Amino acid sequence: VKLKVFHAGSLTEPMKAFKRAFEEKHPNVEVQTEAAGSAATIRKVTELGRKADVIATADYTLIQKMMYPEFANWTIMFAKNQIVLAYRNDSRYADEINSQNWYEILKRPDVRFGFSNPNDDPCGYRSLMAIQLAELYYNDPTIFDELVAKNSNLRFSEDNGSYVLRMPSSERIEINKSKIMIRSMEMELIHLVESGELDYFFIYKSVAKQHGFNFVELPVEIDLSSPDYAELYSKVKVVLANGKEVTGKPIVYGITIPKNAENRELAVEFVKLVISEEGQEILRELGQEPL
C-alpha cells in the first residue's frame, strides 16, 4: 500500500522520521511524501486533481479556508515554530549581524536576501508580516518600505495601527533581482544561500537548525512564535491572490485527512502517530516545540 502524504516544506525533516516510524509499525506500507508550500500543497487536491491521504500545513487555518467543505471538514492543530533570519558563516557581514542591527545590515546595497512566495507558502507571508511588525516594535516606519516595498511591488497599507498587504497574483509579483530572490517554498531558499546567491533568508528556526545555518532571533513581538503576543501579531494581515485573508497569528501547524483519501484507515493511523507523544518528540528533536 502507498500512503500519500502532502506536506508543508518545513515538515520535510520530520516527515523522514514519521515515514521511518510508520513503516516500522506497518511493513506493508510505503509512505510517499511530497513537499510544497502549504497553500500549493493544498491546491494539489483542490485544483490539480490529486488524491492525498494526509495533508499537513504550516498554518492550520489554511485547511479550513481552502478545503472546507468539499475537500475536508476537520483539522487537528499541532506544533509551533518561529521566524528567524538565517545565514552562513561566509554570508556578507555575518560576523557583524545581531538582533539589534539586522535590518540595517539587510539595507546595505551589497547584501542580498530571500523569502518565499506568500501566495504559496506560510513562511513567505509570515516573513513579510514579521518585517512589517518590526516597524511597530522598533517604532521605525521605514523598515518594510526600504527592505521590501522599494524592492518589489509588495506593499502594506496602514490604518490606525493595522496593516494590510494585498498580494498580486504570483505571475504579477515583481522583485528587484539585485536585492531579493523569492521561491515558491522556503525550503528552496536553502539552495540559494548554500550556493552564495543569497546572504540571508527569512526562515523557520526549526529549518535553520536542521540545516546548520546561523540565525538571528527576531523580537518575540514580531516573530510569530508565542501565544502570549497574539494581540501584537494580529495587527498585520495579508490577502493572498486567491482572496483568502491570513492574519498574523502564533505559528501552529495543522493536519487533516482529505475526503477523497484512498487509504483512510492507514491515514488515521498516520495522523495518530504525528500527534502522539512519539510524534511530539520527533518534532521537538527537530526544533518544533509542542502545543
Question: Are both 289 and 163 inside the same structural domain?
Answer: no
Q: In this structure, how many other beta carbons lie within 10 angstroms of the beta carbon of residue 281?
A: 12
Residue 38 is labelled as binding a ligand: yes
Q: What is the CA radius of gyration of the chain?
A: 19
Q: For residues 198 and 113, give the distance between their C-alpha atoms in angstroms, rounded to a whole number.
A: 5
Strand 76-80's sheet: what is its strand order? 30-35, 2-7, 54-57, 252-256, 76-80
Question: Is 9 flagged in the annotation as binding?
Answer: yes
- Residue 228 annotated in ligand binding: no
| 213 shares its domain with 127 | yes
Helix (H) or strand (E) holding 246: strand 245-247
Cα–Cα nearest to 40, from 287, 242, 226: 242
Residue 37 counted as an annotated binding residue: no
Which pairs count as long-range contacts for 21-29, CB under 8 Å and 24+ apart, including other chains? 21/273, 21/278, 21/282, 22/269, 22/270, 22/273, 25/269, 25/273, 26/266, 26/269, 28/1, 29/1, 29/2, 29/3, 29/266
**70 annotated among ligand-binding-site residues:** no
Cell numbers standing for residue 93: 557581514
Please indicate if the annotation marks 122 as binding a ligand: yes
Residue 10 among known ligand-binding residues: yes
Tell me the resolution in Å. 1.1
Are 265 and 145 members of one domain? Answer: no
CB 67 within 8 A of CB 75: no
Length of the chain: 291
Dihedral over Cα of 226, 94, 88, 35: its sign: positive
CATH no. for residue 99?
3.40.190.10
Nearest CA among 222, 120, 106, 101 for reference residue 167: 120
Residues 75 and 186 in one domain: no
* Grid cell locating 235: 495587527
Compute, in degrees rounded to 10, the torsion defined by CA atoms 132, 205, 169, 8: -150
Inter-residue contact 123 to 58 (CB < 8 Å): yes
Q: Count other Cβ atoms within 10 Å, centred on residue 206.
A: 24
Q: Please indicate, yes or no, whether residues 87 and 65 belong to a single structural domain of this protein.
A: no
Q: Does one domain contain both 53 and 103?
A: no
Look up residue 222 and give its three cell numbers: 514580531
Do 89 and 148 belong to one domain? yes
Task: Give the DSSP H or E segment for 113.
Answer: strand 113-116
Q: How far is CA 55 from CA 122, 144, 158, 171, 277, in A?
A: 15, 33, 35, 26, 20
3-state SS class at 83? strand
User: How many Å apart are CA 190 and CA 100, to the nearest integer?
Assistant: 24
Q: Give the HSE-up count for residue 2: Cα atoms under 13 Å, Cβ half-sphere.
A: 7
Residues 116 and 172 in one domain: yes
Separation CA 81–CA 246 (nearest Å)? 17
Spatial CA neighbour of 186 closest among 128, 132, 229, 243: 128
Does 254 show up as a binding residue in the annotation? Answer: no
Range of the domain at 95: 81-251
In the chain, the number of structural domains is: 2
